[PDB]
Amino acid sequence: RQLVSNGFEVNLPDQVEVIVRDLPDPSKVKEERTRLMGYWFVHWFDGKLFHLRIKAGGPNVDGEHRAIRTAEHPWLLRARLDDALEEALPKYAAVKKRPFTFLAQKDELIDAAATAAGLSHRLLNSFKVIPRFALSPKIYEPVDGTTRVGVFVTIGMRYDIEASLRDLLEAGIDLRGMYVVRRKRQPGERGLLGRVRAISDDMVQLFEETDLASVNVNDAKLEGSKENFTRCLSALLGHNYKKLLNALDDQEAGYRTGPRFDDAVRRMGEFLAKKPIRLADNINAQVGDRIVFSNEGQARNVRLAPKVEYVFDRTGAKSAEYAWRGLSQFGPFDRPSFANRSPRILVVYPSSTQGKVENFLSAFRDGMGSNYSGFSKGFVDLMGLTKVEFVMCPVEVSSADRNGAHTKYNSAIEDKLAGAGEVHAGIVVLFEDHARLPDDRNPYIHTKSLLLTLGVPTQQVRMPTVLLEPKSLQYTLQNFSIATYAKLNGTPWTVNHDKAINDELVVGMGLAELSGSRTEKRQRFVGITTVFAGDGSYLLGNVSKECEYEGYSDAIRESMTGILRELKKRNNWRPGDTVRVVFHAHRPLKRVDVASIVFECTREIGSDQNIQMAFVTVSHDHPFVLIDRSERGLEAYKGSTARKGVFAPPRGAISRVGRLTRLLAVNSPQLIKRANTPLPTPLLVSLHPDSTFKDVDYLAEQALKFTSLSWRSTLPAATPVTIFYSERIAELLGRLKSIPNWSSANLNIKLKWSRWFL
RNA sequence: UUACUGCGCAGGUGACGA
DNA sequence: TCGTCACCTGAGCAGTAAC
Ligand SMILES: [Mg+2]
């Protein structure tokens, strides 16, 4: 067993002589870093200023002399390494600092892609795609108790349209509504100027503007987004444009794919190693071996968790390693107890889509047949219901109507339901042009609002989805059917876990930031989800209707304390029973929040039981990546020479970075989509230092199980449902807070068991 | 807004300290 | 009020759906 990292060992001196002096006000640090520039590295920490002489010659410095040892206090050399790595690469210019980030000098993938697919155009040479390397010096533990410093290498692509705006007009590219950014930017200033309304003389007209309502064509380029790229190129190349993207895709894979990335990291290391890195003029550092995660000798830095089982009965007999293979065979987890076996479902659609909807509904309810083995049985027989009655609600509305769409939908729903009687759920079909209208006239959010107020949960769908070719539709209907069943109060599947303790609660927090435009300032909302341990199973609990970011810390403990009281009454804990509480979020909580949570929970359950509490954070966007060299990968498809997910660690691999931090692999070769897919990056799982429960390996495995618990999809989610579901609830409820005639009254009455947020 | 995955860009934000 | 280490969020395009 061995997993290789994207980092290199850094040999540092055992000791270093530093000059220190008390400096309670950090305000004076910036001026001193300038005064001593060139001769001293300077660093502020815990009320004191530290000075490392990096070059002989004055000026001089006062204070106590102390020997800072690397093994004990690695943070000083780690910080110094940020600057020293830059100085060691003078022919590479820093596009950003800490981490030190720079670009490849020779390579440019659009040029190479033009040659490879054989395309040619004038302005093509003004669309630049340049590899981007970052070097992050990070502290890690080979074994518990000992800390070292490693330099980790990450690669990205810099997309940039330096083409002038006057050129893109004359070539027939419509610039109306494209975002625009500055060329020179600009001691700490903003880049985003605004959107393009039209161009005057040597002047652009900006709506949704960040500052001024206009700028010179010279002081403004398009932002290097996919959107802007695809929009420009397609107008300059179509239909030969798709040929360029496949070509560009091949080039990028030349840096992103496992073997390629491993190679690129290897080559980066040799280059950094080829000379000593001058920490000072007399003090040297040196890049060593590629850092590994292994169980070699005293080290215990890698394990593979078992496969996640999907469970479809209360005992645990019926199970599978995939959700859909399991559901097809056994049916949903709660079939025996599922109350409503003849659900009436409202279907709201533009009258002009009648025929296309009927077929989609036919496929959904009654299946696509054995020719399309992804979705054969159809919703009814799949979930083990008697039947599904549709109440058809056509809407006199057209895609071109972008101001009256929402009132037309709501009028039609209102008038339909007035007769009709009670409906248990609804499906709403949307025009592509209506899907992203502002919330004041968006039919998605307004129908959602109306129907959720009335206690009717909805699964919505856009017309391009309804019109998918059969081969895609079958997978679409898998997800559609799973979510709809869950919105009808269903429990499709669970994941295995054998209870070691008498009860286990996991609560998660998710964040949404809402805004009508980029210019407009973003308002923050928060959601809370809960997962319980059961007999052999994890069970999704109740969900918040509380919303605002302010007092989020209070909302957490109220959810926790109220739930703990409910759990204690329900399960009636014995003296000496252990209760565990775990918190998940994408950010760490404050120490004061942890202390407060801990106190309130502890006293609420009382002294009769033992309380274990852990506060976990989950990162997607860190500098670590895992490489498994024993992984040959899988056929890109049955059955070619190309392979996908080469060098990709198995799903469930857990690597030890430190005492509080683990790396979790989630995307196996099986799940990786195609040959050009980059090497996956693992989830970083971090335990808050004030946690009373400590087994982070267990918690990393628990987080993995919770990615399989999502009923949005048949395939696992990117993050555990505790956070993911909470983000969805934060977005919806945040958006609904601005829709008139919205009430949450039914969220814990008619919708109490509905997973309406999927 | 069936989703998953990936990526680009943009905005910044979080925690810890004194 | 600021240093320091860290990485989150939203929008949108494109390819593919775990023996
Ligand atoms: Mg959904």
Task: Check if the beta carbon of residue A165 is closer than 8 Å to that of residue A178.
Answer: no
Q: A26: which nucleotide lies closest, measuring CA to C1'? A: C2
Burial of A415 (0-12, 13-18, 19+ CB in 10 A): exposed
Task: Check if the beta carbon of residue A723 is closer than 8 Å to that of residue A510.
Answer: yes
Q: How far apart are CA A720 and CA A727, in angstroms?
A: 11
Residue type, A491: T
Nearest to A154 by CA among A102, A219, A82, A107: A102
Q: Inter-axis angle of helices A241-256 and A226-237, to 10 degrees?
A: 140
> Does nucleic acid strand B have an atom less than 7 angstroms from the CB of A459?
yes
Q: How far apart are CA A75 and CA A139, in angstroms?
A: 8
Residue A203 CB neighbour total at 10 angstroms: 15
Ranges of H-type helices in A631-709:
696-707
Residue A143 phi, psi (nearest 5): -140, 155
Q: What's the reported resolution, in angstroms, to a tenth? A: 2.6
Identify the three-state secondary structure at position A336: helix
How far is the centre of ligand 1, averaged over its atoms, from the C-alpha of A479 (Å)? 9
Q: How far apart are CA A158 and CA A129, in angstroms?
A: 5
How far is the centre of ligand 1, averaged over its atoms, from the C-alpha of A466 (Å)? 15
User: How far in angstroms lies nucleotide B5's C1' from the CA of residue A98?
Assistant: 29
Q: Is A346 annotated as a binding residue?
A: no
Q: How far apart are CA A612 and CA A579, in angstroms?
A: 6
Q: How far apart are CA A749 and CA A339, in angstroms?
A: 16
Q: CA–CA distance from A724 to each of A492, A557, A744 (Å)?
A: 18, 20, 21
User: How far in angstroms lies nucleotide C9's C1' from the CA of residue A16?
Assistant: 41
Name the percent of chain A in helix, strand, coil, to the closest 5: 30, 30, 40
Q: What is the CATH number of the domain that holds A651?
A: 3.30.420.10
How far is the centre of ligand 1, averaged over its atoms, from the C-alpha of A459 (Å)? 6
Instruction: Categorise residue A648: left if φ over 0, alpha if ψ from -120 to 50, beta otherwise.
Output: beta
- Which residues have a Cβ under 8 Å from the Cβ of A735 and sit 6 or more positions away? A439, A445, A514
How far is the centre of ligand 1, averaged over its atoms, from the C-alpha of A658 (Å)? 37
Q: CA–CA distance from A563 to each of A459, A541, A556 (Å)?
A: 29, 10, 11
Identify the three-state secondary structure at position A636: coil
Task: Check if the beta carbon of residue A721 is closer than 8 Å to that of residue A540.
Answer: yes
User: How far in angstroms lies nucleotide B7's C1' from the CA of residue A157?
Assistant: 9
Identify the three-state secondary structure at position A613: strand
Query: Which residues are registered as beta bridge partners of A205?
Result: A198, A214
The reply to whether omega before A639 is within 30° of 0 (cis) is yes
- Which residues have a Cβ under 8 Å from the Cβ of A684 and sit 6 or more positions away? A618, A619, A620, A622, A624, A657, A661, A662, A663, A664
How far is the centre of ligand 1, averaged over its atoms, from the C-alpha of A607 (Å)? 43
Q: How far apart are CA A742 and CA A94, in angstroms?
A: 50
For strand C, list residues 304-323 of chain A whose Cβ lies within 7 Å of it.
308, 321-323
For strand B, list residues 472-501 of chain A whose Cβ lies within 7 Å of it.
472, 475-476, 478-480, 483
Identify the three-state secondary structure at position A149: strand
How far is the centre of ligand 1, averaged over its atoms, from the C-alpha of A448 (Å)? 11
Quickly tell me which residue has 């509490």 as its tokens: A613
Q: How far apart are CA A274 and CA A702, in angstroms?
A: 43
Identify the three-state secondary structure at position A323: helix
Instruction: Categorise residue A315: left if φ over 0, alpha if ψ from -120 to 50, beta otherwise.
Output: alpha
Nearest to A338 by CA among A538, A162, A541, A488: A488
Q: How far apart are CA A337 and CA A565, in angstroms?
A: 26
List the single protein residue with the shortest CA to C1' distance from C16. Answer: A673
Burial of A337 (0-12, 13-18, 19+ CB in 10 A): exposed
CA angle A633, A637, A641 (to 5 degrees): 65
Quickly tell me which residue has 């093994």 as its tokens: A71
> Does nucleic acid strand C have an atom less than 7 angstroms from the CB of A479?
yes
> Does nucleic acid strand B have an atom less than 7 angstroms from the CB of A720?
no
The structure's method of determination equals: X-ray
What's the sign of the alpha-carbon dihedral A246, A248, A250, A252? Answer: negative
Protein CB footprint (7 Å) on chain B nucleotides: 1-12, 14-18
Q: How far apart are CA A364 and CA A358, in angstroms?
A: 10
CA angle A702, A704, A706 (to 5 degrees): 75
* Domain ranges, residue A712: 494-737
Q: Report strand pairing: A661-664 vs A610-619.
A: unpaired
Q: Report strand pairing: A192-199 vs A40-45.
A: unpaired
How far is the centre of ligand 1, averaged over its atoms, from the C-alpha of A728 (Å)? 9
Protein CB footprint (7 Å) on chain C nucleotides: 1-19
Helices first, then strands: H and E counts in chain A = 18, 34
List the single protein residue with the shortest CA to C1' distance from B9. Answer: A225
DSSP string for residues in A360-384: HHHHHHH---TTSTTS-SHHHHHHT
Task: Check if the beta carbon of residue A484 is closer than 8 Å to that of residue A379.
Answer: yes
User: How far in angstroms lies nucleotide B8's C1' from the CA of residue A226?
Assistant: 5
> Does nucleic acid strand B have an atom less than 7 angstroms from the CB of A596?
no
Element holding A262 (H helix, E strand): helix A258-273
Residue A56 phi, psi (nearest 5): -70, 150
Residue A209 CB neighbour total at 10 angstroms: 17
Nearest to A63 by CA among A22, A16, A15: A22
> Does nucleic acid strand B have an atom less than 7 angstroms from the CB of A673?
yes
How far is the centre of ligand 1, averaged over its atoms, from the C-alpha of A757 (Å)? 7
> Does nucleic acid strand C have an atom less than 7 angstroms from the CB of A372?
no
Q: A515: which nucleotide lies closest, measuring CA to C1'? A: C10
Task: Check if the beta carbon of residue A119 is closer than 8 Å to that of residue A243.
Answer: yes
Residue A330 phi, psi (nearest 5): -95, -20
Structure tokens at A680: 């996956």
CA angle A383, A388, A393 (to 5 degrees): 135
| Residues, chain A | 758
> Does nucleic acid strand B have an atom less than 7 angstroms from the CB of A389?
no
Q: CA–CA distance from A171 to each of A152, A226, A354, A641, A714 (Å)?
A: 43, 19, 41, 41, 45
Question: In the β-sheet with A310-311, what is the strand arrangement from edge to edge?
Answer: A319-320, A310-311, A494-495
Nearest to A237 by CA among A127, A150, A398: A127
How far is the centre of ligand 1, averaged over its atoms, from the C-alpha of A200 (Å)? 44
Q: How far apart are CA A316 and CA A306, in angstroms?
A: 16
For residue A749, the number of C-alpha atoms closer than 13 Å in the C-beta half-sphere is: 9
Residue type, A35: R
Residue A190 CB neighbour total at 10 angstroms: 11
Task: Check if the beta carbon of residue A284 is closer than 8 Å to that of residue A296.
Answer: no
List the single protein residue with the shortest CA to C1' distance from C1. Answer: A27
Q: How far apart are CA A406 and CA A412, in angstroms?
A: 10
Nearest to A739 by CA among A444, A426, A347, A404: A444
Quickly tell me which residue has 């209760």 as its tokens: A579
Identify the three-state secondary structure at position A99: coil
Residue type, A4: V
Task: Check if the beta carbon of residue A633 is closer than 8 Å to that of residue A641.
Answer: no
Q: How far apart are CA A596 and CA A688, in angstroms?
A: 14
Query: Which residues are registered as beta bridge partners of A320?
Result: A310
User: How far in angstroms lies nucleotide C15's C1' from the CA of residue A253?
Assistant: 14
Structure tokens at A224: 């290097």
Task: Check if the beta carbon of residue A524 is closer than 8 Å to that of residue A511.
Answer: yes
Q: How far apart are CA A501 and CA A618, in angstroms?
A: 24
> Does nucleic acid strand C have an atom less than 7 angstroms from the CB of A234?
yes
* A192, A193, A194, A198: CA torsion to nearest 10: -140
How far is the centre of ligand 1, averaged over its atoms, from the C-alpha of A355 (Å)? 23
Structure tokens at A732: 């919806």
Q: How far apart are CA A302 and CA A143, in angstroms?
A: 11
Ranges of H-type helices in A160-225:
165-170
Nearest to A504 by CA among A573, A603, A555, A557: A573
